Write an enzyme that holds these catalytic residues in place. Structure first.
Site, PDB file in Angstrom:
ATOM      1  N   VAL A  33      33.048  36.629  40.112  1.00 12.02           N
ATOM      2  CA  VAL A  33      31.619  36.912  39.884  1.00 12.02           C
ATOM      3  C   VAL A  33      31.350  37.436  38.456  1.00 12.02           C
ATOM      4  O   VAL A  33      30.211  37.589  38.055  1.00 12.02           O
ATOM      5  CB  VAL A  33      30.991  37.832  40.995  1.00 12.02           C
ATOM      6  N   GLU A  72      38.458  40.780  35.149  1.00 13.31           N
ATOM      7  CA  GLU A  72      37.651  39.974  36.051  1.00 13.31           C
ATOM      8  C   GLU A  72      37.205  40.761  37.240  1.00 13.31           C
ATOM      9  O   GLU A  72      37.915  41.623  37.708  1.00 13.31           O
ATOM     10  CB  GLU A  72      38.469  38.781  36.568  1.00 13.31           C
ATOM     11  N   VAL A  73      36.044  40.412  37.791  1.00 12.97           N
ATOM     12  CA  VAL A  73      35.645  40.930  39.095  1.00 12.97           C
ATOM     13  C   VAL A  73      35.424  39.766  40.023  1.00 12.97           C
ATOM     14  O   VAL A  73      34.787  38.796  39.616  1.00 12.97           O
ATOM     15  CB  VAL A  73      34.335  41.720  39.047  1.00 12.97           C
ATOM     16  N   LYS A  79      38.005  44.380  41.034  1.00 17.14           N
ATOM     17  CA  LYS A  79      38.221  44.286  39.590  1.00 17.14           C
ATOM     18  C   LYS A  79      39.709  44.188  39.261  1.00 17.14           C
ATOM     19  O   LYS A  79      40.495  45.059  39.616  1.00 17.14           O
ATOM     20  CB  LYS A  79      37.594  45.491  38.897  1.00 17.14           C
ATOM     21  N   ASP A 108      29.438  54.514  29.069  1.00 14.46           N
ATOM     22  CA  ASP A 108      29.193  53.061  28.933  1.00 14.46           C
ATOM     23  C   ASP A 108      28.065  52.600  29.845  1.00 14.46           C
ATOM     24  O   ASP A 108      28.140  51.548  30.496  1.00 14.46           O
ATOM     25  CB  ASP A 108      30.490  52.227  29.120  1.00 14.46           C
TER      26      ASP A 108
HETATM   27  C1  LIG Z   1      30.047  46.423  36.708  1.00 14.78           C
HETATM   28  O1  LIG Z   1      31.332  46.891  37.143  1.00 14.78           O
HETATM   29  C2  LIG Z   1      31.715  46.511  38.390  1.00 14.78           C
HETATM   30  C3  LIG Z   1      30.889  45.805  39.254  1.00 14.78           C
HETATM   31  C4  LIG Z   1      31.322  45.479  40.538  1.00 14.78           C
HETATM   32  C5  LIG Z   1      30.502  44.707  41.403  1.00 14.78           C
HETATM   33  C6  LIG Z   1      29.930  43.513  40.963  1.00 14.78           C
HETATM   34  C7  LIG Z   1      29.151  42.738  41.826  1.00 14.78           C
HETATM   35  C8  LIG Z   1      28.509  41.561  41.391  1.00 14.78           C
HETATM   36  C9  LIG Z   1      28.277  40.474  42.229  1.00 14.78           C
HETATM   37  C10 LIG Z   1      27.577  39.358  41.748  1.00 14.78           C
HETATM   38  C11 LIG Z   1      27.066  39.331  40.452  1.00 14.78           C
HETATM   39  C12 LIG Z   1      27.269  40.448  39.651  1.00 14.78           C
HETATM   40  O2  LIG Z   1      26.749  40.501  38.400  1.00 14.78           O
HETATM   41  C13 LIG Z   1      27.966  41.550  40.119  1.00 14.78           C
HETATM   42  C14 LIG Z   1      28.884  43.227  43.098  1.00 14.78           C
HETATM   43  N1  LIG Z   1      29.461  44.331  43.489  1.00 14.78           N
HETATM   44  C15 LIG Z   1      30.255  45.078  42.708  1.00 14.78           C
HETATM   45  N2  LIG Z   1      30.722  46.244  43.138  1.00 14.78           N
HETATM   46  C16 LIG Z   1      32.618  45.848  40.914  1.00 14.78           C
HETATM   47  C17 LIG Z   1      33.470  46.548  40.053  1.00 14.78           C
HETATM   48  O3  LIG Z   1      34.757  46.946  40.418  1.00 14.78           O
HETATM   49  C18 LIG Z   1      35.398  46.363  41.607  1.00 14.78           C
HETATM   50  C19 LIG Z   1      33.006  46.858  38.783  1.00 14.78           C
HETATM   51  O4  LIG Z   1      33.793  47.520  37.891  1.00 14.78           O
HETATM   52  C20 LIG Z   1      33.625  48.923  37.995  1.00 14.78           C
END
Ligand SMILES: COc1cc(-c2cc(-c3cccc(O)c3)cnc2N)cc(OC)c1OC
Length: 296
Positions: A12, A19-20, A33, A134
């Site tokens: 995503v 990557e996530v 992540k 950040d």
């Molecule tokens: C921003 O930092 C993070 C974000 C998410 C995250 C992303 C999405 C998602 C889904 C679809 C589109 C989109 O832009 C984001 C959903 N749930 C989440 N928790 C997870 C993270 O660590 C596992 C993360 O690092 C900390």
């Protein structure tokens, strides 16, 4: 451990950090992540924060597990959190406009999250004071109920009052250039003082207010989603780009004319302006911003 039990379904998001992914654990979506080798300190920090501090809060990204694992015969560092299907605030603002209630919900939940980070809570229940470093629309997720939660403690800094000890960690990672406060871009920030880092957060949160407010409809009109400073720096701006624009030219995001004829947006414009004083000491605190938003 939890890593072994997850099926990675789709990617995503991707960048220099790694990557996530959406994966499934126990029949549920989870966000995973996977850190790049160039960013293992951010994994270590987030794991440190989530494991050593009591961090459950409606407006902070909910931790599930941190794990080490092998894939294609090499070590991967994983952080597993709740999955928010509406994605980031950044993505969401592009796919929809907002009404007054939806806009205030987004901004109040950010401010509640941030106040919570900034404030030291005592006792058997609590947490040290924490600055983010950040904050930006990509590090805020939208929940189905319309609230947001704050994500990525990779650069987080802590302070506790008993000892008055500042812990700045050991990460060579810098914050997103687009959102660096002036005193960061001019490198005069006082790195030994917790308050400085709070004030960098406030500066950034001002920009996020600006990004959200643009998408709130008044008099039947809206502005297009844009990132802060879109009109004056390129994509992926350099440190010098931002220095010239924020420090030298003293630029701040423009307030659309039409905001001034709507009260919610007028309140928001004043708030965001007081997040943006060049002098860091002059800026509103998270708790002040939260209380004001609760009034409107
Ligand atoms: C921003 O930092 C993070 C974000 C998410 C995250 C992303 C999405 C998602 C889904 C679809 C589109 C989109 O832009 C984001 C959903 N749930 C989440 N928790 C997870 C993270 O660590 C596992 C993360 O690092 C900390």
């Amino acid at each position: 451990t939890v890593a072994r039990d997850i099926t990675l379904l789709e990617c995503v998001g991707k960048g220099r950090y790694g990557e996530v992914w959406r994966g499934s654990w126990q029949g549920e979506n989870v966000a995973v992540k996977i850190f790049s080798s160039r960013d293992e300190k951010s994994w270590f920090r987030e794991t440190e924060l989530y494991n050593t501090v009591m961090l459950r809060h409606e407006n902070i990204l909910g931790f599930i597990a941190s794990d080490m694992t092998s894939r294609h015969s090499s070590t991967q560092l994983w952080l597993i959190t709740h999955y928010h299907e509406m994605g980031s605030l950044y993505d969401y603002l592009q796919l929809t406009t907002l009404d007054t209630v939806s806009c205030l919900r987004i901004v109040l939940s950010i401010a509640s999250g941030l106040a919570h980070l900034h404030i030291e809570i005592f006792g058997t229940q609590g947490k040290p004071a924490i600055a983010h470093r950040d904050l930006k629309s990509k590090n805020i997720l939208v929940k189905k109920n319309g609230q947001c939660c704050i994500a990525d403690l990779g650069l987080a800094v802590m302070h506790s009052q008993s000892t008055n000890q500042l812990d700045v960690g050991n990460n060579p990672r810098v914050g997103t250039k687009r959102y660096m406060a002036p005193e960061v871009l001019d490198e005069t920030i006082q790195v030994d003082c917790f308050d400085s880092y709070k004030r960098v957060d406030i500066w950034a949160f001002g920009l996020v207010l600006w990004e959200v407010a643009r998408r709130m409809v008044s008099n039947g009109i809206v502005e297009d989603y844009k990132p802060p400073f879109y009109d004056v720096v390129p994509n992926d701006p350099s440190f010098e780009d931002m220095r010239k624009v924020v420090c030298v030219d003293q630029q701040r995001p423009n307030i659309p004319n039409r905001w001034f004829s709507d009260p919610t947006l007028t309140s928001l414009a004043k708030l965001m302006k007081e997040c943006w004083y060049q002098n860091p000491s002059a800026r509103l605190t998270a708790l002040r911003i939260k209380k004001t938003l609760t009034k409107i």
